[PDB]
Design a protein around this nucleic acid. Structure first.
Ligand SMILES: [Zn+2]
Lengths: 99, 108, 98, 83, 237, 98, 87, 120, 99
DNA sequence: ATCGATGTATATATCTGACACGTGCCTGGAGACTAGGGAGTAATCCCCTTGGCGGTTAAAACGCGGGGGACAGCGCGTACGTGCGTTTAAGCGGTGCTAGAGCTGTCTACGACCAATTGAGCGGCCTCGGCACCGGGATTCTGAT
DNA sequence: ATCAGAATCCCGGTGCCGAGGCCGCTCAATTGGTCGTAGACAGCTCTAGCACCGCTTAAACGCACGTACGCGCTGTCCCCCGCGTTTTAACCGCCAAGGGGATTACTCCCTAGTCTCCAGGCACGTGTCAGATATATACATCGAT
């Protein structure tokens, strides 16, 4: 053993948890889980990178929910963006309930 | 008081607290506001829910019960908006959509 | 005695290979080619087994996408057959050959 | 002939299968050497970056990550092997 | 008749002696006159006599049409020459217009790319030029090599005695440049057995073999023609 | 009486507009087009003068670069006349319509 | 009208001779009569894609003028960088 | 003692110390404020300033030649486009850039032109 | 007037000082200067962005002469890279002289 | 239009290794707290943007004439697909060795922070010459003969 | 090609406003120095990469055949070009006026940083069923008669 485990993090449990919420009978192979994990990391790098540019161009030091929203509105095409911003505001307002 | 993960508080499965660390330690900006990780986790969950819905339906149409790389490629390329989001991505073992140009097909 | 007419088994091959996940180049030949190229840049390199697989997935995806755009050019010129000038037009319009 | 050059390991039938996977009905006899030149140029551009990332890491082994980062630079992001 | 030829060649020796700004023009016959590879052919006596006339100052400037490049092979000082059609020994840099000289002929023609990328290094440690090298063979009836035309026209507008050897003046602007020596009030001399379009225009017309005429001319100037001591490469007089 | 051969004036036009560097679309029409388009995204937008010039420079350079690629496609089909299908092929290979 | 104007039909102001001159700079010898309505369509699609981003940059900045930097960043995002406007 | 700095060294700039025209101090300050990494080592901005200076000297060399060939003596955007596009390495570096007021290189596709006589 | 001046930094004097070193009898227009200033900012953002990714993939905190060198070797094509690397090493060794 | 043999389908049983779930462990997310600076918000100066008007004249629009280009037909030659029999070597499994990836430990050279000092770089003003314009003289072509 | 004659080039005059130099001042770079941790260097261990042996049989190879596609040529029609007249509104110069950029001062809400607490997420283990394979059998479809 000698602590060499090192603990590799992934989105695997959350992709699985979302899959079971959407299609309860379906499962996912380890190659497909690796692809889904890569997709999340790519889209995360894009949205965070565009939010960084928006903060910098406006001389702001903070990425806020506005920067993530405009980054989403710039990155995601068409109707996918409009549903994404709806789910984004719903989550942020629910998280601000009682707060 | 008993701890509640910021994901459960936000009504979503994706890890708000992990996405917040990944923002703070990724050097994207000097500061990351408390709404940013919630909004970003909600968007990543929605995009994974869309691609998994379409992939699960493609797998069910192929009569399988596990998602494999074909079903992810079929789900992305048959949708006009996910295909534009993933325009330059290649998926390992995904294959390509079954298309043949109309003029290549037989005359009768 | 029996023989299928020309282009129909090619059309069966289009219909078959578009239905499959598999890699289409032989694996040991692709290993020797990747090593031959890398030795021009640094002597005595090793490869992770999965690094060769990542190069094969990317290069086969690239060649397939190039052949799809090559087909569009051949068809536009009123040909069924792809030719080297179709590959060169596709690569010029995409910004590779410019 | 035992004296095979490595680039001729990308056989004529392997190129036909790649063209057929891309929807091509009929393939000219001059396509194969052009396709090999295209493939060698593609691999030189991806391997030069992968070897640059390897040398930068002070290690002798090319890893799946060095190839993924080379492809991400080229504007050809590959999902399957990591982030 | 040979006696009339000798008297006219004597008078040509007087014209050449007396004139202060002699310009030579040459065509393909004079270089062909050894019985003509472009690499293997030794320069004909005419060329060497031109070098000798240059050495004594009986030549202001030189024009030629001869694609053989034997004027280049003879090391006639390059700065005093124009070879209006281009030369099988000469290439140019596109990106910065420097020139060169080479052991091999260029071989290609038509201002095409000869497979060399220039050699001019630069302060301040910038890249060497890397500019495409290109052959000098014009193909047909474009604008000439710009400097070679400008100098040939200029010298013609500035010369009191043009002399035209193995020349048909028919290629424009080339053979017409000798009309700028005439138009300013200078003299013109033509030496050929062949017909020519401007044949009416000269102060002296010779019919005779050009190497024989030039060998005679040199004898009448009292000059030995130098035998060629192998190839020559003088950029400058 | 005098008449240039059809296509020779067109050829001089190429040489001239390639030598020159000014903007080719009329400035007032381009301003009104930009304002009509932008009115779909917000009411009562205003534009800096340099902002419209930058939109014209970018759009006018994009149109020119597309016509180069369109000409390549027209020539490849053994034509000298560009047609809508050539613009469509160039936009398909460049990944704009794909 | 001194304030609050609405616009339409301005696309036909990208004149037939204007499209000709652009094709000339891009090396085109001969142009079919159908090209003008296709090119107006392409120009409008391009120009909407740049303007959508430019206006989302104005909205993020909380201001009512489109600035040169908004257009420069919109073009940079789309892999189409413009030099000469202060980027 | 700090009174040495108050009376000695005379502010030999990091640029003049490295033999550069480009501002090492400004390149360093931009690398720190741009959030590119947590730390920025002393050689990084000297190296980056040397590279930006090399690339600008390269474009100005080619643009000054293009200006001289047009018989001009001040460089204008046309000369920068003519410099960048005639060099195979700079055209690949600036492959996604449009230069304002730059135009395009004079170029006709060869099948469009007429044809000529010969006699050898 | 009225103490409302606001300085804007530019590469203009350095581009000018380099121009007079390469071509002493040449000038530059205000639009050509604005283009050169934008070119420098683009190439700076490319090299610094790749040096950032290089540092992060290797789990390092510091951008150094390494990282800049390998970013330059990745980004620049051809001999433009080898000359840029030679100039960078020459500047860093000269700067390290008398340390 | 029917007929036949080939390939894709489909139904069956059967065997096997990847995924789904369970358990133990330790790491990182959370909770409650503090400290200070980022950016929200309001009030002001004044830039530059939008609108309106009258002349001008360059460009756009309409027409008409006609020639060169698109493109539909058809003919011919060679190049590429389908097939089958022979040769190669890729793929498999097994066994062996040791280079180097990966981790853990120890140390110190590097660079972030900080305050005090100065000149390098910016905005603004003014001069004058590089160059846009052009009207005048020549030549260098292209149409007239 | 010969003939004047355009058609354009080369040049000297003029003129203006943009590039280059100069000034002065302010804030960004430099200097000297301390602190503490990122990372370079060494030592070990055990993964997985490279090398080799021989066996099987899928695949590549190479040669024959002939069909259909490429492309070369040609004729006919109509669509686009060039040019002349008229119409238009782009452009420009002026003048009006106020929306909204940009800069400033105030101030409190927010998020970095901290310590300790504990349960979520990772690695490791093991069992079984979703799926792959082998085999039997029915239907779809292609191409010849
Ligand atoms: Zn050169």
């Amino acid at each position: 053993k000698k602590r060499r485990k090192t603990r590799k993090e992934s989105y695997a449990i959350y992709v699985y948890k979302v899959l079971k919420q959407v299609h309860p009978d379906t499962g996912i192979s380890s190659k497909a889980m690796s692809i889904m994990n890569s997709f999340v990391n790519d889209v995360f790098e894009r949205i965070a990178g565009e939010a960084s540019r928006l903060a910098h161009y406006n001389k702001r030091s903070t990425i806020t929910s506005r920067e993530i929203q405009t980054a989403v509105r710039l990155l995601l095409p068409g109707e996918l963006a409009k549903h994404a911003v709806s789910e984004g505001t719903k989550a942020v307002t629910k998280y601000t309930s009682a707060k | 008081a008993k701890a509640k993960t910021r994901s459960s508080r936000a009504g979503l499965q994706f890890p708000v607290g992990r996405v917040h660390r990944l923002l703070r330690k990724g050097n994207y900006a000097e500061r990351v506001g408390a709404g940013a990780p919630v909004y970003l986790a909600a968007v990543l969950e929605y995009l994974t829910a869309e691609i998994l819905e379409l992939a699960g339906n493609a797998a069910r149409d192929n009569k399988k019960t596990r998602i494999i790389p074909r079903h992810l490629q079929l789900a992305v390329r048959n949708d006009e908006e996910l295909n534009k989001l993933l325009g330059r991505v290649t998926i390992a073992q995904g294959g390509v959509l079954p298309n043949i140009q109309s003029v290549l097909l037989p005359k009768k | 005695p029996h023989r299928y007419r020309p282009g129909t088994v090619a059309l069966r091959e289009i219909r078959r290979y578009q239905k499959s996940t598999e890699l289409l180049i032989r694996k040991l030949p692709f290993q020797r080619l990747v090593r031959e190229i890398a030795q021009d840049f640094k002597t005595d390199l090793r490869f992770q087994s999965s690094a060769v697989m990542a190069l094969q997935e990317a290069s086969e995806a690239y060649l397939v996408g190039l052949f799809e755009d090559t087909n569009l050019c051949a068809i536009h010129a009123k040909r069924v057959t792809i030719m080297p000038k179709d590959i060169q037009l596709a690569r010029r319009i995409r910004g590779e050959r410019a | 002939k035992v004296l095979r050059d490595n680039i001729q390991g990308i056989t004529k039938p392997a190129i036909r299968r790649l063209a057929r996977r891309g929807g091509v009905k009929r393939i000219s006899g001059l396509i194969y050497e052009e396709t090999r030149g295209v493939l060698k140029v593609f691999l030189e551009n991806v391997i030069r970056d992968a070897v640059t990332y390897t040398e930068h890491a002070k290690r002798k082994t090319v890893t799946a990550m060095d190839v993924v980062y080379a492809l991400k630079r080229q504007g050809r992001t590959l999902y399957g092997f990591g982030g | 008749p040979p006696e009339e030829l000798e008297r006219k060649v004597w008078e040509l020796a007087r014209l050449v002696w007396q004139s202060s700004s002699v310009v030579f023009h040459t065509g393909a016959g004079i270089s062909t006159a050894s019985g003509i590879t472009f690499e293997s052919a030794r320069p004909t006596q005419t060329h060497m006599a031109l070098v000798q006339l240059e050495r004594v100052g009986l030549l202001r400037f030189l024009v030629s049409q001869n694609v053989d490049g034997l004027h280049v092979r003879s090391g006639f000082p390059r700065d005093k020459l124009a070879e209006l059609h281009g030369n099988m020994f000469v290439e140019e840099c596109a990106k910065c217009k420097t020139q060169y000289v080479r052991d091999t002929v260029v071989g290609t023609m038509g201002l095409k790319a000869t497979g060399r990328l220039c050699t001019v290094a630069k302060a301040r440690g910038l890249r060497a030029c890397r500019g495409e090298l290109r052959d000098t063979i014009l193909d047909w009836e474009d604008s000439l090599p710009d400097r070679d035309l400008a100098l040939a026209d200029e010298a013609s507008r500035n010369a009191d005695l043009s002399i035209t050897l193995g020349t048909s003046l028919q290629i424009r602007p080339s053979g017409n440049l000798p009309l700028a020596t005439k138009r300013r009030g200078g003299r013109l001399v033509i030496v050929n057995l062949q017909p020519t379009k401007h044949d009416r225009h000269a102060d002296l017309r010779i019919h005779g073999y050009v190497d024989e005429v030039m060998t005679r001319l040199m004898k009448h100037l009292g000059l030995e023609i130098p035998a060629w001591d192998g190839p020559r490469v003088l950029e400058r007089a």
